[PDB]
C-alpha cells in the first residue's frame, strides 16, 4: 500500500474579526503664533487754552 507524508492542515487563528481601524496619530507642523497687540487708542479732553 502507498506510503507518503500525511497532509496536515493548520487551523485556529482568526481572520476578519472585530474590525477596529484606529491607526491615526494626531499632530502636524505649521506656523507657531502671531505677535500682535494694540492699545486703547488715545483720549483727548482739553480745551479753554489753559496755558
Amino acid at each position: 500500500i502507498v506510503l507518503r507524508g500525511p497532509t496536515l492542515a493548520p487551523t485556529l487563528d482568526r481572520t476578519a474579526t472585530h474590525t477596529v481601524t484606529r491607526p491615526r496619530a494626531l499632530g502636524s507642523f505649521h506656523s507657531t503664533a502671531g505677535p500682535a497687540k494694540h492699545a486703547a487708542s488715545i483720549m483727548a479732553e482739553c480745551k479753554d487754552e489753559s496755558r
Partner: protein
C-alpha cells in the same frame, strides 16, 4: 494621494489652534454640539370639537 482626504486633512484644521481659538472655543464648562439634553414634558392630548 488625492483620495486620502476621507478622514485626514481635518487634523491640520484641529491643530490650527491659537489664542483667539482659546478665547472663543474650549473650556471645562464649554458646551458641545452632537449632544442633545432631553427633559420630560407634560402628558396631554388634543382633538377638534364642535
Amino acid at each position: 494621494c488625492t483620495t486620502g482626504a476621507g478622514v485626514t486633512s481635518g487634523f491640520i484644521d484641529l491643530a490650527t489652534y491659537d489664542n483667539l481659538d482659546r478665547a472663543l472655543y474650549g473650556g471645562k464648562d464649554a458646551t458641545t454640539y452632537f449632544i442633545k439634553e432631553h427633559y420630560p414634558v407634560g402628558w396631554f392630548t388634543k382633538l377638534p370639537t364642535m
